[PDB]
Design a protein around this nucleic acid. Structure first.
Ligand SMILES: [Mg+2]
Ligand SMILES: [Mg+2]
Ligand SMILES: [Mg+2]
Ligand SMILES: [Mg+2]
Ligand SMILES: [Mg+2]
Ligand SMILES: [Mg+2]
Lengths: 79, 517, 85, 101, 195, 132, 315, 49, 88
RNA sequence: GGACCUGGCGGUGCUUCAUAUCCCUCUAGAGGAGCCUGUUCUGUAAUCGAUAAACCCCGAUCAACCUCACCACCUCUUGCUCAGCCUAUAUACCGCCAUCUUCAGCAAACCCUGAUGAAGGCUACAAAGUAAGCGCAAGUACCCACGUAAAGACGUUAGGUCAAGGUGUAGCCCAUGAGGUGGCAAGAAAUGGGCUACAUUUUCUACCCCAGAAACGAUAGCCCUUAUGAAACUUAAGGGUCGAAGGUGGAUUUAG
DNA sequence: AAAAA
C-alpha cells in the first residue's frame, strides 16, 4: 500500500514536530493558543501532506499579519 | 498469440498470417484514433501509473525558439517544416536527431540538406561524414563516400566504423570479378584502424562478409576470414556473416560439404549457446544449417539446430513465417527420411500440429514415409490440410495418397485406406480430371464395395477417358463372376467409343462373358 | 439521463405498442396501424459515414500477398455510397 | 448529448465547491471559536456571504448518475431505488440476491 | 464464409500433462477439457445443458489449474527462496523472552486498479512490559501517564498509532513515544512531591 | 401480476435460453450472477465506479457487435484483470472476428488502464434451452 | 437416439480415464464415489439447489429411459396386450389375477384332499416407466391386501415381496450420558441446551446437598423471581431428587425465562446418567427431554408486527 | 465527467465504430416528421411568420 | 512445506435492507435483498520472512476474483537503541 | 317474434365448509382530548398526479438554500451540448406493480356427439381423452419432514406511474427554453393515519424488580443554550416559572 | 386489413 504514494519521501519528524514552522508568533496568548490548536489539527491528519500544512500555516500567518488593526485594538500585541 | 476456441484455430500459415495482420491493423487504428482525440484518454484511475498508457505527441511545443523548436518538430511534412524553420530562425542543425531523420524520411533531398548544413555551418566533421556515407550507401554513391572518408580522415578526428562499413559495402556491391580487391580493402581498413588506435566492429565485418558473398559463387574464404577477425576482437561475431558464408558455400559446395560444415561450426561457435543479441539476421544461419542437415541427412547439425532453437532462448529459431515454415518442413522431411516411424510421428506432432500445415514436397515425403512403414489411416486430414494450405498441389497430393491403395488387393482390416481414398476423391470432385477419376475408380474397385466401385466407374466413364487395362480386366472378371455381363459390355463400349487401345480384346472378353457366363 | 439507450427490440416494442389493452377489445380501428421494418440489414461490419478503409473489415486484408495501408475515402466515393443507400 | 439541466447545475456546483474549499474551510475554522474578538468573526461572515452562490457543499444533492433523481437515491452505488432493483434482477451485482430468509 | 474444425476433445491423448494445458486460471473453454460435465436445473422430461454454451460453467470459476502434481512441483521449485526456522524459537515462551515486541500490519485488497487503501495505515504496537527494566516509581509513573492503554491482566502495552499515510513513519513515532515514556519515568519534576 | 426480467410465454415459437428463462428469485438457486467482484461486500469501497464501468462496457460490447452476442457478458474483476467471457455466432469471417477482438482489447486496455484479454466461445446458432 | 446414448457412454468412460490419469490414481480403482468427490472438488459450484450441481454419473441416470418400440418391421406388436395404451400395468394385473386364481385352486385342492410398507404411485410409475392414475393404484393396493389375507406359499410370498419396500427406523429412545471421571470425579457429567437463544451447561453432582450454584453464587441472588425457582424445582420434583444433588450451571445470554428454560433443559439432559431408562422415558413423554422451537419469527413488510397488520379500511 | 463519455459515444457513432440504434431511430423519426410537412423552422422565424 | 496450521470459521454477517417495489402508491408490497459475506481465516505460525513472502506470492498467484485478502503479519523485534539506560 | 349455447345475477333450492371467521365469545385498537402529516377550501401571482374495496406521515428514504417541474422583477437569442421542452396526452408503449387470486385451471395439435348450429365430451363393478408449456405440488433459505420467507399464469379495473428511466401525437425553438432576487409552507371550517393519557396492575430516591414515599402525565405557548449550516423562521436535544382537555369513547370498524 | 468467393 506504499508503492507510488510515499509522501515525497518524508519521515516522522516532519509530520509530528511542527515547532520549526512558527517564528512570527508570540509565546503566551490567544494567538499562540490558536496556532497550537491548528498545529495539533494538522498533526493528526493522515490525509494531507506536509507541504499543504506549511501552506496553510503561512496563509494563516499572512491573514493575521494583514488585519493588524483589530489585533492592536484587542488590548494585546501581536508578534 | 491467437485464441483457443476450436472454430477459430489456425489450420495453416495463411490463417495465422491473416490473424496476425488483422491484430496489427487493429492496434494501429486504435493508436491512430487515440492520437486523433487525445482529450478522451487522459483521465487516469490507476495508481502505479503505467508508462505505456500515454500516447505520443507530434506537434511542436516551442514557437519563439530556434534549435529547440527544430528538434521538437523533427523528433516529436514535418522534416521539411523543421528545416525551413531552422533556416529562417538561423538554427544550426546538429548531427543527431536531424541528418538521420532527414535521411530516413526523405535520397537527393537529404544529401542536399546535408550539403547546405555543411556549407552554412562548420561544426563536427566526422559525424557529418559518417551520416553522409550512411545516407549515400542506400543511394549508390562511391565518390561521395570517398570524399566523406577523406574529410573524416583529414579532420584530425577518429573515423567512425559506420562510414567505413558503408564505403566497403558500396565498393563491393557491384564488384565484377574482384578477388584481391576485397583483401586489399580489408588490409587498408585494418591499417587505418591500427593507425587511428581503434578496433574493428562486428557490424562492419558482417557487412563486408555479406558483400563478399553476394558477388562470387566461391568466395566463402573472405567471409570466413572476416568472421574470424570479428570473433577474435574480444566479443562474439555476428550471425549475419556466418549466414552469408554458409549461403556462399552451399552454392559452390555441390561435390563436397566441408565448407558447409566449417560454416556451420563457425556459426555454432559464434552463436550456439546463449542467444546473444548482436546481429541483424540470427535465424538465417540456423535455417541454413537445418537445410544443409536435411539435404545431407546429418544427425549432428540437426540436433545442434534443435538444441539452439527454442530449447534455451527462442531468438534465432524463427526470423519470420516463410523461413520458419521451410525449416519445419525440412526438419519433418529429415525426421521422416532418417529414422523409422516413431521420430516421424513425433516430428509431425511437434511441428505439423504445433506450427501450421505442410506444403507439397514435405507432404509427399511424409506420405511416402507413412506408406513405407504401413501408416495409412490419417491421410484424409493431411489431404485436407494440403488443400487448405494450397489449392494447386491438392490434386497431386490426393493422387499420391490414393495410389498407395489403388494398386493393392482387398484385405480384411484395410478400411482406413479405402476411407482415405474416398475422402480424397470427394475432395478432388468438390474442388474445381481423367487421371484422378481413373485412380479413384481403381481404388474403389480394389477396396471391396460393389456399389461404390460401380459409382466410381460410372463417374470416371464420363470424363472423356476409359479405365486402364488392369481395371477393365478386373471389371470384366467381376461381371463374368456375377451372372451379369452388363458391366463388361459397358466397359467395352466405353473403350471402343473413347478410341482406346483395348478394343478387340475387350470385345472378345465381352462376347465370352455373354456366351459362357 | 445518458445510460438509458436500451436494445433496438425494446425501442420497437415501445414504439409499435402491439402489447396493449386496445388490441383485445376492438378499441382501435384496423386502418390505424404502424408496420415494422428491419433497420440493421444492409450495413457491413464497420460501416461509417465518413469513409475510413478498414483492412480487416471493408477492403480485403491480404492483397496479392501484401498489406494495404490504412487510408481514408474522399468525398466523391462518400457521396456515391450515400446515393446508393 | 444530455437532456436535463438540474444534473448539470448540480455537477457545476460540485465542481465549484471542490475548487472553493480551502477558503470555506478557513472561514469555518475562524467561525467556531470562543476565543478571538467578534469583529473578525463578523467580517468573516460578511466575506463568506458576499461570495456568489452555486459554490457550497450544502447545495450538494445526492442524485443518480443514470436517471438524475432528486429524492430516493442510495449513497453506496450512487443510484436510485428502481435502477438498483433493475440491475439486481438482471444480474450485474454479484452477491446482491433476493431476500428469502 | 462457413467452415468446420474438430475440437481438442478427440485430438489430444490420455497420457498427457494437465497443467501444460490449463496453466493460468482460464475461464473454462469447452475445447481442451475432455470432461462432459453437466450442470444446471433440468426439466421433468428432458436433458439439461452439457458443457458447450453452458453459462453455469462459465460464470463459476473452474479449478482445473491446481493439479496435485503441479502443486507439488510448484512447492518444490520454491525451496530455493525459503529460510529454515531456528530451533531456538520453537516454543512461544522462548520467543516471548527473546523477542517481546510485536508489530502488527494491515494489508487488505480492493477490486479494480485502485491500490491505495484508507484502512491500511494502522500499526498497533504490542510490547510486553514484563521483561523491561521497570522499578516501582518509574513503573507507577508510566502507568499513570498511559492511563487505559495498558492491560492489567496480560500486561501487554497496546498503543494505537496512526498519524501518517505510511507505516514505517508510524513505527518510528511509536518507538520515539516509548523512548520518551521510558525517559520520563526516571525523572522527577517539581509537582511530583505533592502527589 | 409481478413480472421481472423473465420471458412471457405466448404460444410455442420463442426459443429462449437459460439466462432469459429464469426469475430473479432463483439467482442464488438455479442461476447466478454475470459479474463477480469484491466491491459488493460489506466493508469495501469503490463500487459505484465499478458498476458504471461494467454498464459502460456492456453498452459498448452490445453496440459494437450488431447481434453477435447470443446471451450476455460474464466479467471477472480479479485485482487488475478484466476477463471478457462472451459468445460470438458463426456467421462472419474469422479474420474480422480476430480484428474486432484485437481492437476491443486495445481500446479497453487503453481506456480502463487495465490489461484485458478476451476469450471467445463460438456458437453455431442462437443459444436455446426451452421453447417457452 | 441410441447412438447419442452410446456417445455419451464413451465420453463418460474417456472422461473417467482421463480423470484417473490426472489424479495420479488407477483407472480400475477409481470408483463412482471418487468420481463424485473429484467432480465436487474441481468444480466449486456456488449454488443452493442440488439439481444445479455438476452431475456426471452414469449416463442412464441423467438421460430419460427411452421406451422401446413394441412393433418390428412387420408392424405386429410384441406383447399380447398392446392395443390399449397401458400395456405393462394391465399385463401385471392379468398376471396377479392368474396368481390369485392359482392360489384359490390350490387352497380348494388342499381343503378337498385334507416392518415394511408397500409401493406408491410415484415409485410404480418410475419403475414401470408408465404413467398411471390413482383409482387403478387403489384397486391394485386393495387386490394386494386381499391377497395377503388368504394363504400363500413361498413363491407367492417372494412374488408379493418383490413389489415391497422397507420402512425406516423408529427407535426414538434417549441417550445415556457416559459417566466421566476427571481427576477424582465420581458422579460427574455435563450436557448442553438451547431455548430461544440461551446457551446453558449443567454439571450434575450427586454427592452434594440441595442447592444450585449459578456462576459461582447461588440461584437465589440471580433468580429472584419465583417462576425460575419453580422451573428449576420441577425436574427435581419429577425425579424425586430434591435435596440430594448440588448441581452447578453456567448460562450466558437471554432473559430470565429463557435462561431458566435453558438451565432446566440442560439439567434434564444431564440427569440421564445416574438413573434407569424407564424414568427418562416417563420424563420425555411428559414434556422434559425435548427442545422448545418457539423462536421469534421474522417481521413481515407492509404490516405492523409479525402477524398484526395495519388498520385496513373498507369504506 | 459524463460529457467526455457522451462526446466519445458521439464520435464513435459518427465514424461508424459504434452502432447506436436509439440515435438512429431518433434520426429516422425526425426525417419522417420533416418529410410529413412539419419540420423545424429556421433561425429567427416562426411566431412572427 | 512445513507450516502446521489449523482450521476455524468466524461467525458470518448478513445485511438485509427493505426497499420499495413499484414507483407510486405501493408501500404494502416491499422487496428486500441480502448480502451473504462469510469469513474463512487461517493462522500461519512459525514462518520466517522469505517463507512468508513465498506463501503470500503463492496465495496471490491463485487468488480468485470472488474472495478478498487481509494480510496481518506480526514481525519480531529485540530492543530499540534507547530502552536500556538512556539519558536523552 | 319463436327456438338453442355461454357468462353475470337470483333478498334461487338441497348438502358440506369459513379456524380470526358469525356470534353465543377471548385479547389489543380508531371513532371522545391534544399534536404531527395527507384531501379540499379561505385572500393572494403563487405548483402536478392519486382522491371506492386495490390511496394517504401517498410519489418523498426530507417543502429552510440546489432539493421549488409555482409566480413576480431584471436579461439572452448556436440562445448552451451537431440540440431540445419539467407544454398537453398511460384514451400510444416498453419497464416497475396493485385487489380479484387467502386459488386450480389457462391450456399448441386430433377424435366423437349436437343430422357437420351457436357448443359439449363427466361415471375405475367406468357410457370418449391421451395430451408441449404455464399454475399448485414438486424446490431454495431459517430451527429438519411443522411453520415462515420466497414464488403464484392466461384476464378484469381504457387501474397507478408519459413527474424511476427511454419512447408515440399537437405546438415552440428571437420560446412554454435558459442566467440572478423575493414570495407561496397562515387558518373561517369539513377530514384519514400515527403518537401521548384516561389510577392504585401509576410514579419518585437510588435499585435492573425482599426497601422507603407520593390518596397519573405532559401537547402547545415564553426566554436561553448546545452540535451542524452562508442566514434559525418547525427540523435534534436540554435548562428556567407558568402549562389545555381528559376517572375509559354511542351508531360505525381492524388485527390476532 | 411476400421475402454477407
Ligand atoms: Mg406479486
Ligand atoms: Mg419551466
Ligand atoms: Mg390516462
Ligand atoms: Mg407468495
Ligand atoms: Mg412452491
Ligand atoms: Mg391516474
Amino acid at each position: 500500500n506504499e508503492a507510488g504514494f510515499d509522501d515525497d519521501g518524508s519521515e516522522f519528524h516532519e509530520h509530528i514536530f511542527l515547532e520549526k514552522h512558527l517564528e512570527s508568533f508570540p509565546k503566551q496568548g490567544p494567538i499562540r493558543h490558536f496556532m497550537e490548536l491548528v498545529t495539533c489539527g494538522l498533526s493528526k491528519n493522515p490525509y494531507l501532506s506536509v507541504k499543504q500544512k506549511v501552506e496553510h500555516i503561512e496563509w494563516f500567518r499572512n491573514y493575521f499579519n494583514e488585519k493588524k488593526d483589530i489585533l492592536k485594538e484587542s488590548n494585546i500585541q501581536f508578534n | 498469440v491467437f485464441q483457443d476456441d476450436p472454430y477459430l484455430m489456425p489450420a495453416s500459415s495463411l490463417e495465422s498470417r491473416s490473424f496476425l495482420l488483422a491484430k496489427k491493423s487493429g492496434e494501429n487504428v486504435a493508436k491512430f484514433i487515440i492520437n486523433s482525440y487525445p482529450k478522451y484518454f487522459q483521465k487516469d484511475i490507476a495508481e502505479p501509473h503505467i508508462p505505456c498508457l500515454m500516447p505520443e505527441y507530434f506537434e511542436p511545443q516551442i514557437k519563439d525558439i530556434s534549435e529547440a523548436a527544430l528538434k521538437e518538430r523533427i523528433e516529436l511534412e514535418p522534416s521539411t517544416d523543421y528545416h525551413f524553420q531552422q533556416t529562417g530562425q538561423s538554427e544550426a542543425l546538429e548531427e543527431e536527431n536531424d541528418e538521420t531523420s532527414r535521411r530516413k524520411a526523405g535520397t537527393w533531398r537529404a544529401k542536399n540538406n546535408a550539403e547546405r548544413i555543411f556549407s552554412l555551418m562548420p561544426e563536427k566533421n566526422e559525424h557529418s561524414y559518417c551520416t553522409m556515407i550512411r545516407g549515400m550507401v542506400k543511394h549508390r554513391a562511391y565518390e561521395q563516400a570517398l570524399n566523406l572518408y577523406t574529410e573524416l580522415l583529414n579532420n584530425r578526428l577518429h573515423a567512425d566504423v559506420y562510414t567505413f562499413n558503408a564505403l566497403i559495402e558500396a565498393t563491393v556491391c557491384a564488384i565484377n570479378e574482384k578477388f584481391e580487391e576485397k583483401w586489399s580493402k580489408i588490409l587498408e581498413l585494418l591499417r587505418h584502424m591500427v593507425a587511428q588506435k581503434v578496433k574493428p566492429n562486428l557490424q562492419t565485418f558482417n557487412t563486408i562478409l555479406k558483400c563478399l558473398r553476394r558477388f562470387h559463387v566461391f568466395a566463402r574464404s573472405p567471409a570466413l576470414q572476416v568472421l574470424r577477425e570479428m570473433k577474435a576482437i574480444g566479443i562474439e561475431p555476428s550471425l549475419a556473416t556466418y549466414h552469408h558464408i554458409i549461403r556462399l558455400f552451399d552454392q559452390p559446395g555441390d561435390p563436397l560439404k566441408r565448407s558447409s560444415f566449417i560454416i556451420y561450426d563457425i556459426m555454432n561457435e559464434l552463436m550456439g549457446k546463449r542467444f546473444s543479441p548482436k546481429d541483424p539476421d540470427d535465424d538465417k544461419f540456423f535455417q541454413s544449417a537445418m537445410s544443409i542437415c536435411s539435404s545431407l541427412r546429418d544427425l549432428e547439425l540437426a540436433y545442434q539446430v534443435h538444441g539452439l532453437l527454442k530449447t534455451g532462448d527462442n531468438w534465432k529459431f524463427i526470423g519470420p513465417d516463410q523461413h520458419r515454415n521451410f525449416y519445419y518442413s525440412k526438419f519433418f522431411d529429415l525426421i521422416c527420411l532418417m529414422e523409422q516411424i516413431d521420430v516421424t510421428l513425433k516430428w509431425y506432432e511437434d511441428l505439423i500440429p504445433s506450427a501450421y500445415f505442410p506444403h507439397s514436397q514435405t507432404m509427399i515425403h511424409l506420405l511416402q514415409a507413412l506408406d513405407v512403414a504401413n501408416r495409412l489411416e490419417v491421410i484424409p486430414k493431411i489431404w485436407k490440410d494440403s488443400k487448405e494450405y494450397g489449392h494447386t498441389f491438392r490434386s497431386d497430393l490426393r493422387e499420391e495418397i490414393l495410389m498407395l491403395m489403388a494398386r493393392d488387393k482387398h484385405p480384411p482390416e484395410l478400411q482406413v485406406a479405402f476411407a482415405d481414398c474416398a475422402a480424397d476423391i470427394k475432395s478432388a470432385y468438390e474442388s474445381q480430371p481423367a487421371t484422378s477419376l481413373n485412380c479413384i475408380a481403381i481404388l474403389f474397385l480394389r477396396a471391396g464395395r460393389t456399389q461404390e466401385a460401380w459409382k466410381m466407374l460410372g463417374l470416371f466413364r464420363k470424363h472423356n477417358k476409359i479405365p486402364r487395362s488392369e481395371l477393365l480386366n478386373e471389371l470384366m472378371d467381376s461381371a463374368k463372376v456375377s451372372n451379369s455381363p452388363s458391366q463388361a459390355i459397358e466397359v467395352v463400349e466405353l473403350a471402343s467409343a473413347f478410341s482406346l487401345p483395348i478394343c478387340e480384346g475387350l470385345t472378345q472378353r465381352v462376347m465370352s462373358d455373354f456366351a459362357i457366363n | 439521463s445518458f445510460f438509458t439507450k436500451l436494445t433496438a427490440d425494446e425501442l420497437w416494442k415501445g414504439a409499435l405498442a402491439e402489447t396493449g389493452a386496445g388490441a383485445k377489445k376492438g378499441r382501435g380501428k384496423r386502418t390505424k396501424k404502424k408496420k415494422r421494418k428491419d433497420l440493421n440489414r444492409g450495413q457491413i461490419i464497420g460501416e461509417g459515414r465518413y469513409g475510413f478503409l478498414w483492412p480487416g473489415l471493408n477492403v480485403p486484408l491480404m492483397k496479392n500477398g501484401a498489406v494495404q495501408t490504412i487510408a481514408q475515402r474522399s468525398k466523391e466515393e462518400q457521396e456515391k455510397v450515400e446515393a446508393d443507400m | 448529448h444530455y437532456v436535463d439541466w438540474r444534473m448539470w447545475r448540480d455537477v457545476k456546483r460540485r465542481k465549484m465547491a471542490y475548487e472553493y474549499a480551502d477558503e470555506r474551510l478557513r472561514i469555518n475554522s475562524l467561525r467556531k471559536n470562543t476565543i478571538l474578538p467578534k469583529i473578525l468573526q463578523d467580517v468573516a461572515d460578511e466575506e463568506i456571504a458576499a461570495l456568489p452562490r452555486d459554490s457550497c457543499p450544502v447545495r450538494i444533492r445526492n442524485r443518480c448518475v443514470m436517471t438524475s433523481r432528486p429524492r430516493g437515491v442510495k449513497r453506496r452505488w450512487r443510484l436510485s431505488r428502481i435502477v438498483f432493483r433493475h440491475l439486481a434482477d438482471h444480474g450485474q451485482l454479484s452477491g446482491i440476491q433476493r431476500a428469502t430468509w | 464464409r462457413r467452415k468446420a474444425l474438430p475440437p481438442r476433445t478427440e485430438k489430444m491423448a490420455v497420457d498427457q500433462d494437465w497443467p501444460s494445458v490449463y496453466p493460468v486460471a482460464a475461464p473454462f473453454k469447452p475445447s481442451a477439457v475432455p470432461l462432459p460435465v453437466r450442470m444446471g436445473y433440468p426439466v421433468k422430461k428432458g436433458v439439461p445443458m452439457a458443457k458447450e454454451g453452458n453459462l453455469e460453467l462459465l460464470k463459476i470459476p473452474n479449478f482445473l489449474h491446481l493439479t496435485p502434481v503441479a502443486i507439488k512441483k510448484h512447492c518444490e521449485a520454491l525451496k530455493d527462496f525459503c529460510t529454515e526456522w531456528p530451533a531456538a524459537l520453537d516454543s512461544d515462551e522462548k520467543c516471548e523472552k527473546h523477542f517481546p515486541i510485536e508489530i502488527d500490519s494491515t494489508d487488505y485488497v480492493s477490486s479494480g486498479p485502485s491500490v491505495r487503501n484508507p484502512r491500511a495505515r494502522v500499526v498497533v504496537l504490542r510490547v510486553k512490559l514484563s521483561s523491561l527494566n521497570l522499578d516501582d516509581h518509574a513503573k507507577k509513573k508510566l502507568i499513570k501517564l498511559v492511563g487505559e492503554r495498558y492491560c492489567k491482566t496480560t500486561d501487554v502495552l497496546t498503543i494505537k498509532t496512526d498519524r501518517c499515510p505510511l507505516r514505517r513513519q508510524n513505527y518510528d513515532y511509536a518507538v520515539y513515544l516509548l523512548t520518551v515514556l521510558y525517559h520520563e519515568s526516571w525523572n522527577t519534576e517539581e509537582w511530583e512531591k505533592s502527589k | 401480476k409481478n413480472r421481472a426480467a423473465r420471458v412471457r410465454v405466448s404460444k410455442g415459437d420463442k426459443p429462449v435460453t437459460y439466462e432469459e428463462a429464469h426469475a430473479p428469485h432463483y439467482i442464488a438457486h438455479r442461476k447466478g450472477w454475470l459479474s463477480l467482484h469484491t466491491g459488493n461486500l460489506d466493508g469495501e469501497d469503490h463500487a459505484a465506479e465499478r458498476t458504471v464501468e461494467d454498464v459502460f462496457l456492456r453498452k459498448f460490447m452490445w453496440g459494437t457487435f450488431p447481434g453477435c452476442l447470443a446471451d450476455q457478458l460474464v466479467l471477472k474483476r480479479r485485482g487488475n484483470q478484466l476477463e471478457i467471457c462472451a459468445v460470438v455466432l458463426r456467421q462472419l469471417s474469422p479474420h474480422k472476428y480476430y480484428f474486432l477482438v484485437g481492437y476491443s482489447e486495445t481500446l479497453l486496455s487503453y481506456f480502463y488502464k487495465c490489461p484485458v484479454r478476451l476469450h471467445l466461445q463460438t456458437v453455431p446458432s442462437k443459444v436455446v434451452y426451452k421453447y417457452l | 437416439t441410441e447412438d447419442f446414448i452410446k456417445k455419451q457412454i464413451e465420453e463418460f468412460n474417456i472422461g473417467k480415464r482421463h480423470l484417473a490419469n490426472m489424479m495420479g490414481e488407477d483407472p480400475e480403482t477409481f470408483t463412482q464415489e471418487d468420481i463424485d468427490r473429484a467432480i465436487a472438488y474441481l468444480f466449486p459450484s456456488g449454488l443452493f439447489e442440488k439439481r444445479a450441481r455438476p452431475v456426471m454419473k452414469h449416463p442412464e441416470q441423467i438421460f430419460p429411459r427411452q421406451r422401446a418400440i413394441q412393433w418390428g418391421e412387420d408392424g405386429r406388436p410384441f406383447h399380447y396386450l398392446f392395443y390399449t395404451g397401458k400395456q405393462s400395468y394391465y399385463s401385471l394385473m392379468h398376471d396377479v389375477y392368474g396368481m390369485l386364481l392359482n392360489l384359490e385352486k390350490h387352497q380348494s385342492h388342499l381343503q378337498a384332499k385334507s416392518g415394511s410398507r408397500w409401493l406408491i404411485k410415484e415409485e410404480l410409475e418410475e419403475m414401470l416407466v408408465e404413467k398411471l392414475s390413482d383409482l387403478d393404484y387403489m384397486q391394485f393396493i386393495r387386490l394386494l391386501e386381499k391377497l395377503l389375507t388368504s394363504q400363500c406359499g413361498a413363491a407367492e410370498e417372494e412374488f408379493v415381496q418383490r413389489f415391497r419396500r422397507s420402512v425406516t427406523l423408529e427407535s426414538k429412545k434417549q441417550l445415556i450420558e457416559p459417566v466421566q471421571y476427571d481427576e477424582q470425579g465420581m458422579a460427574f457429567s455435563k450436557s448442553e441446551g438451547k431455548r430461544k437463544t440461551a446457551k446453558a451447561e449443567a454439571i450434575v453432582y450427586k454427592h452434594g446437598s440441595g442447592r444450585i450454584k449459578v456462576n459461582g453464587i447461588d440461584y437465589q441472588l440471580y433468580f429472584p423471581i419465583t417462576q425460575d425457582r419453580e422451573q428449576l424445582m420441577f425436574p427435581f420434583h419429577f425425579v424425586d431428587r430434591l435435596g440430594k444433588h448440588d448441581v452447578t450451571c453456567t448460562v450466558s445470554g437471554g432473559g430470565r425465562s429463557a435462561q431458566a428454560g435453558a438451565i432446566r433443559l440442560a439439567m434434564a439432559k444431564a440427569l440421564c446418567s445416574f438413573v434407569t431408562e424407564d424414568e427418562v422415558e416417563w420424563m420425555r413423554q411428559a414434556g422434559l427431554l425435548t427442545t422448545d422451537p418457539r423462536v421469534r419469527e421474522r417481521k413481515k413488510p407492509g404490516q405492523e408486527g409479525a402477524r398484526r397488520k395495519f388498520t385496513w379500511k373498507k369504506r | 465527467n459524463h460529457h467526455t463519455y457522451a462526446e466519445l459515444m458521439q464520435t464513435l457513432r459518427f465514424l461508424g465504430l459504434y452502432r447506436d440504434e436509439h440515435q438512429d431511430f431518433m434520426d429516422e423519426q425526425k426525417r419522417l416528421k420533416k418529410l410529413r410537412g412539419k419540420e423545424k423552422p429556421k433561425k429567427g422565424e416562426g411566431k412572427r411568420a | 512445506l512445513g507450516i502446521s496450521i489449523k482450521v476455524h470459521e468466524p461467525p458470518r454477517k448478513i445485511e438485509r435492507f427493505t426497499l420499495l417495489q413499484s414507483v407510486h402508491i405501493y408501500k404494502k408490497h416491499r422487496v428486500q435483498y441480502e448480502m451473504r459475506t462469510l469469513y474463512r481465516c487461517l493462522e500461519l505460525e512459525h514462518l520466517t520472512g522469505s517463507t512468508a513472502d513465498v506463501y503470500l506470492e503463492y496465495i496471490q498467484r491463485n487468488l480468485p476474483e470472488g474472495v478478498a485478502m487481509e494480510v496481518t503479519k506480526t514481525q519480531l523485534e529485540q530492543l530499540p537503541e534507547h530502552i536500556k539506560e538512556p539519558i536523552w
